[PDB]
Amino acid sequence: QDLSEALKEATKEVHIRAENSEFMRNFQKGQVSREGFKLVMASLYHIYTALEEEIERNKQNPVYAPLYFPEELHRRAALEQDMAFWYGPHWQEAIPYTPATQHYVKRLHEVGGTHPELLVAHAYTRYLGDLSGGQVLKKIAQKAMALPSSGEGLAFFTFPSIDNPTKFKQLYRARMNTLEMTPEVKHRVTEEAKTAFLLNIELFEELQALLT
Numbered sequence: 133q134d135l136s137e138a139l140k141e142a143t144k145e146v147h148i149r150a151e152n153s154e155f156m157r158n159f160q161k162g163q164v165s166r167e168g169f170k171l172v173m174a175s176l177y178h179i180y181t182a183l184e185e186e187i188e189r190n191k192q193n194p195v196y197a198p199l200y201f202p203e204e205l206h207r208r209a210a211l212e213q214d215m216a217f218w219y220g221p222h223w224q225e226a227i228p229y230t231p232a233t234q235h236y237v238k239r240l241h242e243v244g245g246t247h248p249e250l251l252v253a254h255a256y257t258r259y260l261g262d263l264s265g266g267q268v269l270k271k272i273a274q275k276a277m278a279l280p281s282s283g284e285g286l287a288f289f290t291f292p293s294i295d296n297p298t299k300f301k302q303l304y305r306a307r308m309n310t311l312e313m314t315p316e317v318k319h320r321v322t323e324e325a326k327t328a329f330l331l332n333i334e335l336f337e338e339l340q341a342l343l344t
């Protein structure tokens with residue numbers, strides 16, 4: 133079984149639970165205000181920063197290298213732009229760093245520093261999601277909060293270096309299947325992906341609690 137197939141199958145159930153979490157539900161209903169949106173985007177800033185720091189650390193490692201696409205996928209730069217938009221010039225010392233976000237970042241550094249062979253699970257969970265649900269969320273965000281088609285405030289959801297997301301995802305899945313795979317690694321990579329989804333679910337549950 134190809135890694136891409138194993139991952140889709142391993143996370144199809146938890147994905148249903150994630151996309152139907154209370155926070156995503158309210159978001160899809162346009163009931164989230166500037167406050168909630170700023171909270172989640174700030175959390176993603178911390179998460180992608182940690183993820184990409186670990187990707188850079190392991191870019192030359194064959195257990196990840198084939199998936200090294202900073203120009204097309206990395207979000208830190210976009211998030212820095214979005215943070216400046218929503219939080220202003222001094223966003224640096226203004227954005228929050230919630231416990232659930234810290235927990236996610238912690239696991240990211242553990243994976244990147246001690247179990248790099250599992251980093252693909254985290255890149256897969258974040259980036260493939262961004263190229264999917266993230267695109268529908270972008271349109272919902274624009275409508276609900278009156279964000280211009282121009283893109284300001286939604287740089288995170290914009291991939292200027294990717295012409296066709298559907299096509300890129302197919303290329304990304306194919307490349308995922310070229311990584312050195314053993315029953316051992318495939319087993320743990322799919323487990324870490326489920327873990328990644330859970331960390332996301334926990335972040336959302338925490339943010340929803342903080343907002344209500």
Ligand code: HEM
Pocket residue numbers: 136139140147150151152156256257258260261262264265266268269301329332
């Ligand atoms: C706002 C709720 C969400 C919506 C509307 C949504 C919707 C979708 C859609 C339409 C697909 C299928 C795309 C395709 O087959 O090419 C997809 C795939 C995916 N989503 Fe989501 N999603 C949501 C939340 C999430 C979350 C919270 C994550 C984890 C950060 C996530 C991660 C993924 C991944 C990793 C895939 C690719 C699965 C695969 O092909 O192996 N999604 N999503």
Ligand SMILES: [Xe]
Pocket residue numbers: 172269
């Ligand atoms: Xe989001």
